Amino acid sequence: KFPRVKNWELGSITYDTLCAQSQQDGPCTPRRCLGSLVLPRKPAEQLLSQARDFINQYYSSIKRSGSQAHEERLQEVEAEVASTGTYHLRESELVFGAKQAWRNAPRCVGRIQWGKLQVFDARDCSSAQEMFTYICNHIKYATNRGNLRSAITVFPQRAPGRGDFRIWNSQLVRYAGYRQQDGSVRGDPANVEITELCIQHGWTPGNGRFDVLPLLLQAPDEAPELFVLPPELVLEVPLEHPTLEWFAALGLRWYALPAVSNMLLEIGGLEFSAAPFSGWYMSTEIGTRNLCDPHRYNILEDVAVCMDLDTRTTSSLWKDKAAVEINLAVLHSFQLAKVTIVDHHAATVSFMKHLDNEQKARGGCPADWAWIVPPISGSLTPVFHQEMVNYILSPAFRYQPDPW
Amino acid sequence: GPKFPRVKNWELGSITYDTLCAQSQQDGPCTPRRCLGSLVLPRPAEQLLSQARDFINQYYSSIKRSGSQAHEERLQEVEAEVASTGTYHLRESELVFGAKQAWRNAPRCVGRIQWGKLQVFDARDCSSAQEMFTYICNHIKYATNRGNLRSAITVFPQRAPGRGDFRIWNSQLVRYAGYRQQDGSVRGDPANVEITELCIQHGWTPGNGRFDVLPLLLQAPDEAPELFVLPPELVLEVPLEHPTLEWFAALGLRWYALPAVSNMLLEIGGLEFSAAPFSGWYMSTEIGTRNLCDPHRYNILEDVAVCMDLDTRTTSSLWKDKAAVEINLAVLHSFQLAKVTIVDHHAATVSFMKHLDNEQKARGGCPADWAWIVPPISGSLTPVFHQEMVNYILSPAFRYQPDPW
Numbered sequence: 089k090f091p092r093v094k095n096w097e098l099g100s101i102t103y104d105t106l107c108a109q110s111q112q113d114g115p116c117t118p119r120r121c122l123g124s125l126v127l128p129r130k131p132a133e134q135l136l137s138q139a140r141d142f143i144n145q146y147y148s149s150i151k152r153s154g155s156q157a158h159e160e161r162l163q164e165v166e167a168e169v170a171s172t173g174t175y176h177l178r179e180s181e182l183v184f185g186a187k188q189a190w191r192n193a194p195r196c197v198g199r200i201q202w203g204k205l206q207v208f209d210a211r212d213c214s215s216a217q218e219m220f221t222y223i224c225n226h227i228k229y230a231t232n233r234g235n236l237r238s239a240i241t242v243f244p245q246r247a248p249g250r251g252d253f254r255i256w257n258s259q260l261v262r263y264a265g266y267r268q269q270d271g272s273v274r275g276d277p278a279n280v281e282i283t284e285l286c287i288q289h290g291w292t293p294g295n296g297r298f299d300v301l302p303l304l305l306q307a308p309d310e311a312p313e314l315f316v317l318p319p320e321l322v323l324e325v326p327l328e329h330p331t332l333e334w335f336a337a338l339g340l341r342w343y344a345l346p347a348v349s350n351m352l353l354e355i356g357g358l359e360f361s362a363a364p365f366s367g368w369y370m371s372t373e374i375g376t377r378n379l380c381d382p383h384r385y386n387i388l389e390d391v392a393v394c395m396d397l398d399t400r401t402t403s404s405l406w407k408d409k410a411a412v413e414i415n416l417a418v419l420h421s422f423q424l425a426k427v428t429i430v431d432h433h434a435a436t437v438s439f440m441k442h443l444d445n446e447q448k449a450r451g452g453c454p455a456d457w458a459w460i461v462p463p464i465s466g467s468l469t470p471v472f473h474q475e476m477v478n479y480i481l482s483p484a485f486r487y488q489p490d491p492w
Numbered sequence: 493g494p495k496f497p498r499v500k501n502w503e504l505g506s507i508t509y510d511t512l513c514a515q516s517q518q519d520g521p522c523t524p525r526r527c528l529g530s531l532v533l534p535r536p537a538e539q540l541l542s543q544a545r546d547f548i549n550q551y552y553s554s555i556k557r558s559g560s561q562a563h564e565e566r567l568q569e570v571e572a573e574v575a576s577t578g579t580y581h582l583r584e585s586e587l588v589f590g591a592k593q594a595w596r597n598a599p600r601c602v603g604r605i606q607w608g609k610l611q612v613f614d615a616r617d618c619s620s621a622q623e624m625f626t627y628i629c630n631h632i633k634y635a636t637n638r639g640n641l642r643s644a645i646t647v648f649p650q651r652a653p654g655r656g657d658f659r660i661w662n663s664q665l666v667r668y669a670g671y672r673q674q675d676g677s678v679r680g681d682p683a684n685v686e687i688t689e690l691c692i693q694h695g696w697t698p699g700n701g702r703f704d705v706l707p708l709l710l711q712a713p714d715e716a717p718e719l720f721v722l723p724p725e726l727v728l729e730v731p732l733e734h735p736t737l738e739w740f741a742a743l744g745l746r747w748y749a750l751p752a753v754s755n756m757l758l759e760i761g762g763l764e765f766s767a768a769p770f771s772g773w774y775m776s777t778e779i780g781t782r783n784l785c786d787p788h789r790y791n792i793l794e795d796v797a798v799c800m801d802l803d804t805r806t807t808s809s810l811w812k813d814k815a816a817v818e819i820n821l822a823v824l825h826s827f828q829l830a831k832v833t834i835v836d837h838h839a840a841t842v843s844f845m846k847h848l849d850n851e852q853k854a855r856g857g858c859p860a861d862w863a864w865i866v867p868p869i870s871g872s873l874t875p876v877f878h879q880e881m882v883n884y885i886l887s888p889a890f891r892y893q894p895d896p897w
């Protein structure tokens with residue numbers, strides 16, 4: 089019933105009682121574990137239950153649980169669903185759901201910050217045009233000249249009649265990927281499809297490796313519309329190396345703001361199909377995955393040749409050496425440009441602190457080991473040695489289909 | 493789609509479905525409500541017979557004589573034997589087959605491309621702790637082969653009704669002492685603190701180095717275990733040096749050549765081999781990253797970063813990453829120089845991808861534990877980081893088993 093959970097470095101044991109609050113099945117069965125899969129294979133009575141449970145969550149969180157205001161709020165929601173099929177959240181309830189969805193996210197190592205989230209209410213949005221204004225204000229706020237501040241902006245919820253509000257881009261800042269005659273890619277290979285969708289809805293493309301993409305924003309049942317982000321709003325960091333001089337000449341750079349924009353926010357049964365959120369980068373996201381993945385910018389080889397390493401054989405560990413400097417370069421450059429970054433040691437240490445905090449607060453913390461453990465130097469970080477239970481709690485961020 | 497797990501590689505964009513998982517006869521620890529895949533250890537006449545029949549079925553499949561007269565006579569032979577004894581016995585070639593299949597089935601092993609090349613020593617005639625020792629010594633000699641390492645397993649008698657087990661108390665054939673100090677620290681390998689203390693309690697005269705090879709504690713049925721010292725010439729060790737950091741040799745770090753797991757249970761067709769030590773060759777990250785750099789193992793990262801002159805006061809210098817890479821290069825360099833088989837985490841994972849593809853064609857999938865397959869340094873620099881994996885238990889298997897004491 090309740091899983092024993094051991095840290096292998098310290099020999100300490102806890103018991104997860106929180107997982108008993110899960111009400112959504114993940115992918116695993118007793119016959120086989122599917123925990124390393126990235127995606128899943130994927131009614132008034134049931135909306136009422138999710139809503140009840142979430143309002144309960146809310147009033148508990150403000151300690152007014154059971155009181156008059158709590159009863160009256162449960163009545164409003166019920167009366168509203170029975171009549172209309174749906175309901176709406178109060179701004180304060182929303183703010184709480186957003187924080188909580190972040191707190192519940194098993195794949196996020198940055199959760200120590202969960203209580204500090206600026207929530208922009210954009211539920212009074214009726215056009216791609218308005219979406220764009222809200223998106224620009226979010227970016228300005230979040231960026232704050234390099235002093236990054238966590239933020240979410242919440243667009244109008246999904247409804248029975250109509251199409252969704254959608255940001256088509258997976259992130260608010262993305263570099264173009266250009267498919268070439270010879271089938272190779274200029275720019276970021278991850279963004280091939282979105283680059284092409286932009287061109288098709290009328291974008292004049294560049295030809296660089298680091299061209300910031302426009303936004304395709306979709307108001308309900310309408311064609312998506314194209315919006316260019318003003319260049320001065322997209323803070324970028326040119327990459328250099330503390331001791332390696334040539335490195336700067338590789339012309340590498342990355343943007344400051346990691347802002348997820350294709351994920352669905354679910355609160356109390358209500359669904360928010362456009363609810364972009366941002367914090368700040370952990371350097372291994374840029375240094376290791378975005379620049380070193382073979383199906384990304386794939387720069388290892390370039391770098392190692394520049395370092396004059398023996399590229400001929402795996403056992404010289406040239407890949408491990410190059411990766412280490414590229415990560416160092418990212419940290420150096422962000423520090424130099426006074427933009428917020430966290431290294432993977434600092435981040436995982438504070439994740440451990442968060443795990444402890446959550447054990448005392450809620451009796452557990454849903455966590456996805458494969459995603460929490462950094463993509464270089466796993467066992468050198470404390471999370472490697474930590475056993476973790478993965479389950480789904482609501483409020484949640486979920487994946488959702490692409491709108492095309 | 494088919495109703496079998498869809499499995500994706502996010503580097504190459506390629507897709508497969510694991511149908512082999514259908515053959516699983518045993519529940520792991522996960523449920524629809526929570527995944528427990530990161531946990532290291534999560535918590536009879538008719539049962540035996542049906543496990544047996546299934547294994548015999550596998551054997552006869554594997555020789556392409558499935559449904560034959562020799563198949564139905566073997567089945568009949570097996571049930572007769574249980575009917576009159578409560579147990580049964582494997583033919584020689586059956587044990588060979590099932591030992592290989594147990595390796596083949598091991599979700600945590602990245603070295604499985606090698607699974608068809610296992611020397612199987614049959615030691616089911618063994619009858620004393622002294623004889624266990626001779627067998628083990630022969631195993632080590634053969635497996636070691638002056639540094640040209642060869643995979644091997646030695647199989648001692650299976651569990652019997654009421655009669656006591658054969659047990660190797662040590663967790664590996666080669667293990668370094670861990671001495672608990674008066675200041676509360678540990679000299680040597682802290683992983684081996686309990687076994688060192690049991691060795692002394694059973695009459696071993698301990699040393700006081702960081703790298704004292706432990707003696708073997710060997711248990712024959714219903715007997716207290718007996719102590720045997722390995723002759724130093726049988727235990728091949730590699731002194732560690734670095735190709736360019738001249739001072740690294742001065743640290744006096746060393747590791748042994750032969751990784752030989754001695755405390756796991758080999759289960760075949762319901763039969764349980766409580767002593768069945770097996771060995772291969774190391775992947776370099778086991779030594780240089782885990783055994784040397786784990787904070788609860790040798791913990792040498794700081795010391796090495798100091799020697800390298802790194803800024804150890806700030807996480808953001810990546811001093812931990814830089815030192816681990818060098819310790820890892822030193823392991824590879826030194827094994828190479830000493831002509832002792834070893835494989836780096838790149839070569840190994842590449843070959844595990846080849847193995848996945850072979851197994852896809854051969855069996856329709858491959859049970860694999862992603863957290864153990866991905867190496868503990870440079871994870872996403874290896875092709876297996878990007879490969880989804882399905883984890884499940886197939887038999888024959890190696891399982892963990894309660895410590896004999």
Ligand code: HEM
Binds near residue numbers: 196197199201430
């Ligand atoms: C405050 C600084 C933060 C840091 C350092 C951080 C760190 C990370 C990292 C490293 C990942 C894995 C990313 C990847 O591999 O692509 C991640 C995932 C995630 N984070 Fe954060 N995070 C932060 C803030 C936030 C915020 C503000 C939210 C939402 C309000 C959030 C929600 C999520 C979610 C839902 C995922 C899973 C994404 C997915 O499934 O693709 N994080 N976080």
Ligand code: HEM
Binds near residue numbers: 772774778840890
């Ligand atoms: C041929 C060279 C081999 C290599 C490079 C290799 C590689 C590995 C590695 C790196 C591990 C993880 C070790 C750890 O983190 O504790 C492992 C685990 C394992 N291997 Fe191998 N292996 C090899 C041969 C073998 C052989 C010959 C067998 C048995 C016949 C075997 C069976 C196992 C089992 C059962 C595990 C899991 C052990 C556990 O859960 O503690 N491997 N293998």
Ligand SMILES: Cc1cc(N)nc(COC[C@@H]2C[C@@H](OCc3cc(C)cc(N)n3)CN2)c1
Binds near residue numbers: 258367368369370373
């Ligand atoms: C808030 C935040 C902070 C921070 N430091 N980093 C992030 C990174 O965002 C995570 C994104 C979400 C994931 O993308 C969604 C996705 C899923 C799948 C299956 C495919 C695909 N192309 N894209 C992969 N990385 C987000």
Ligand SMILES: Cc1cc(N)nc(COC[C@@H]2C[C@@H](OCc3cc(C)cc(N)n3)CN2)c1
Binds near residue numbers: 753771775778893894
């Ligand atoms: C055969 C082989 C080759 C190779 N390159 N590497 C290996 C590594 O062996 C795996 C080790 C031994 C295992 O010990 C398991 C164990 C230990 C203890 C103290 C108790 C227990 N129940 N089970 C875990 N990791 C084995």
Ligand SMILES: C[C@H](O)[C@H](O)[C@H]1CNc2nc(N)[nH]c(=O)c2N1
Binds near residue numbers: 125458502877878879
């Ligand atoms: C296939 C595997 O699950 C996939 O590569 C995962 C592994 N761990 C990850 N971890 C993080 N943080 N982000 C990722 O994109 C991935 N990818």
Ligand SMILES: C[C@H](O)[C@H](O)[C@H]1CNc2nc(N)[nH]c(=O)c2N1
Binds near residue numbers: 530863
């Ligand atoms: C908690 C976690 O499961 C544990 O640290 C695992 C992670 N992956 C591993 N992988 C291997 N190969 N060996 C190990 O000992 C571990 N330890």
Ligand SMILES: [Zn+2]
Binds near residue numbers: 116529
């Ligand atoms: Zn699972």
